[model samples]
Target chain A: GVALGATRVIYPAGQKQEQLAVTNNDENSTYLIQSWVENADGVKDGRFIVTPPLFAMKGKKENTLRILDATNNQLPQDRESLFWMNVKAIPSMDENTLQLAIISRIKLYYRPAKLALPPDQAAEKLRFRRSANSLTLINPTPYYLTVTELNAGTRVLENALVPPMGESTVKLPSGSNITYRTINDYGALTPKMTGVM
Target chain B: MNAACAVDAGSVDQTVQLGQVRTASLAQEGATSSAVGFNIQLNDCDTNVASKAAVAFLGTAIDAGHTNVLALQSSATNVGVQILDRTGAALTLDGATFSSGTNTIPFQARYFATGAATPGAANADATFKVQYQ
Candidate 1:
């Protein structure tokens, strides 16, 4: 078994390279790590290259995986983009019993260098619109907003992932007061941002 | 700037004591009168992409084929423990979620005595993972 060093990944738009660390804690087991990047639509993107795509990690050891943006000029340059980092750990199976491997996936945010606001500040710039039976979350800033919990009074509505300069709509009561919380870059939910609607 | 954007994930750990239960108490009534409640406190979070966080608790059973009762890993008798959610419902294998930044979730642990419960070390080890979306 192994543990991911970070809860999520942030690949700055202009950065040439980024790194992720994985540590194997089980002293008796070895793991084969495989990694890839994909978009929200589940389409694999080859623009980001994960170094040492496949390798064997010995028990009680550590490995660093490098992510290089191969598509130097193709990605967006004005706002943050979203991607998924899929890391699968295939355990070395024993000759006798079957072992289940774990595929750990986390969000990868590509933040543009031209953006004026930082991630923490941009998250506070989210706007909300309320219409009949629907709630619209607007991200006019250059940072992706991950809404973990959207509450209308005491009722919890479905969460939404609003990309940079994008909008996400969810069903909600027509006239309820909206209080929402967003996940920060570190995966901690922000204190409630009240009265959006 | 690169250092500021780095993701330093947060974690928390806590040990809950279910306290002692008399074997005769179980003979009179199967389960403990009241379960001990506890909380898992999460802090130092920096990532905001998790739509939700799922916590799955796993433990080994004391008696053979009885997965409902959590057996102490290093014990001789058949004594065990049971975990419950804040609602007093038996905790499901599917686990619970941290939907909001309300960083703390509640859980209850009680002693599980079956047939003639023995007295020894009534400890149980549970491993939990937090799955984020």
Candidate 2:
């Protein structure tokens, strides 16, 4: 069996989908993906009690949100901040570049950027800003997640990532050329290609 | 007044069992650590394998006073790269030539009437490096 690594939990700072590295150089990187079923008592958490998405359940019940108050509170408050992560599948040899896609389910906590005074504060007029936050992937990826923030003006926050995998694709004019290839063979491609076999 | 009337009633019985409901929690902590083998398709003879894999990038000459996007290719195949404008239409490069013999290609983008050149402005406007297995 492949040894498990610590998970890396990443998020875009603002309201945009940021690009991040899912794995690092060491084999011990992890990312939290989904909610785990098996609990301490060996009894499943959500097998019988079906609930809506955590973001949708906010402010309705006393404590119904899964991301905020789910079983054991999935968000890491202290040392519970990391997990072991890895790629779910081995890559294929036929593809030139590989794309890693991830779907994140999170509880968004929003507040005003700067505090407003009592008399002048208006619900719709307040200027909201993002604060610092942290988390851990339940089943994280074994690699690092490199993140890149885009300039404002574009919509959508989280989506997919692709690292030049095995090698650098930068080509030089001084009789030096770099090629990108899949992991399965050394026949026609470069080693910089990852994720795909 | 001494006489009494008869009445009917039903009876029920049930049983419940608790079978070794167990609860035990344990947490262990430790410290940590984390691509691809590659293919080398070449002409004639045999396949050449490397110990590592990587990627390289090349930019256009900035002195050309224009914006140019070059197509990435290997032999006869084309790698995909998108060309986009920040606010206006796609700029055109006038009498520009791209050289890929050594894998270094120039990238240039043109704006209305004036073109921006990079290679002359930044020594070698194009740059590239490799990631190995």
Candidate 3:
């Protein structure tokens, strides 16, 4: 088994570097660790640079991976921008039996210094619009909201992720009552938030 | 820019054997079920802020709003699989959530004989994403 030290990755605006640690926990196995960055669209992004892009770790060994912004300051510095950090472990073939490797992907958020709003507060600053066949969510803050569930009465819409300074629309029947839960940095949803729309 | 972080670590590939299901029995009983339990093991998952973690099951059929049934990709004849939660309840797209340590999420793969009850190989695949709170 391989373990990641952290659940999510954050890049502060104007920061030079951030780090994450990976460890090999198998008693008698070695693994090849590969890392990369991807945008929300699942395409590899060139703006983020990961150090030691690839390496080998023996059983019970650990290594630190470094990430630096290489976008030449092209990323937005107002609100938060979201990305994905992908780490894949390819286990060395065992001569005795077959084994499988695991891959871990976590959210990577970029927050600009100019935006002083904290993540919890940023989540509270979301806006919603209701229509005949769709419910639209507008996020004006600098933090990304991983909306796991959006409930309008008994109806629930799943897998709705609203980007910072952007919007996400879900098809649902129009209703007066609206409630939602946003995923925090730890991948857990906040308490059901209810408000008048 | 400020960086926020969440951690998740676990093995990638997991295989579950559903054993052999007789086509005649499935057709007569309407459906057969098997447990395909797997764990998302986490170790030393520490973060600056307190948070929780959840797993989201994603795939072609799952994304297409087919929450109760998991579409089989194989050419097996007249067979479909339904994913169930640990409590034997149908697993929706919302998935299951747990704390920030080693967690085991149990699942059941219920096989149904649809249309003609011809038997062959039955297999299905699903990808999951771990979301942080």
Candidate 4:
């Protein structure tokens, strides 16, 4: 099934087209496009577009992501830029494992994770406690994470985890976003972790 | 500098006068079988004792009276000659004048100090090489 997860309207209108893998399209995947419009020369307003799986409909019956040029024609480009995607596999029970990797390139960046703790030191004594349906993650450790450029393969760009307890991985497509969740059951607040060069 | 040739009176004229001339000559002296020698003496306590410093030969005869003969001082100073005999006790006999019958004279002009007498330490009967020019 075709799915359009995210869309922006600025760069596409300016004649610049960028492709991004918003989701794995793993379950009943289909070809879909997200685009935006931007002012490039003022005289010629163009579309800023991203065609993922840009090689799907090549008269072959394989699943692919495709991007259309101004005339709706497929442009020949490096496959490295086409299949770059970030993968976050949530175990449904344990916290999800985040791995960033390029779909066409060979490597993945592993991000170090930190868990947030509750405010009450007594409550913090419990690493991950459950109350009702929510989990209270106390004192989430902070991490410095980064991934290698897509074609360069996955090299750790940054890794600074202080709590030394959480598990996280940075994956391919150098700049893919990895979604994670933090709960502070012990009343401890969790600081936001960041990605650096 | 000027270059000229010289000719005797038999030539016509002394037109070309060369510079002054210097002359030199040599003579020879014959050799003899006579023995050349020297004497070593120990003049005072400082002289005969090893402490008094001087150069001395190792294998010659010294007149017997002098306590010291031409010898290397106990300290091994090879500087000046050492005297073993005091004025009265000094060996006065000339070594060259001694007869082969009495050739073993006890002393000479140089003397070595007799300190803690080690038998082989004393070199009273010593001789040295000399050019008889």
TM-score of chain A, model number 3: 0.86
Docking class of 1: incorrect
User: Per-prediction TM-score, please?
Assistant: 0.60, 0.15, 0.63, 0.14
User: lDDT of each prediction vs. the true structure?
Assistant: 0.63, 0.19, 0.62, 0.21
Give the per-residue lDDT of model 1 (tens digit) for A50-80. Answer: 9889998776677898988877677788887
**Interface CA root-mean-square deviation for model 4:** 60.1
Sorted on lDDT, best first, the list reads 1, 3, 4, 2
Which sections of candidate 1 miss by over 4 Å? A95-98, A173-175, B1-51, B54-131
Clashes of each: 10, 124, 31, 78
Give the number of the best model, judged by TM-score. Answer: 3
**Candidate 3 per-residue C-alpha lDDT over B82-107 given as tens digits, one digit per residue, 9 for 90 to 100:** 65665776655333322233344455
Point out where model 3 deviates above 4 Å.
Answer: A95-99, A116-118, A173-175, A185-191, B1-102, B105-133
Worst 10 residues of 1 chain A by lDDT: A93-102
Q: 2 or 3: which has the higher DockQ?
A: 3
* Best-to-worst TM-score order: 3, 1, 2, 4
Chain A of candidate 1 gets a TM-score of 0.89
- Window of ten residues with lowest summed lDDT in model 3 chain A: A93-102
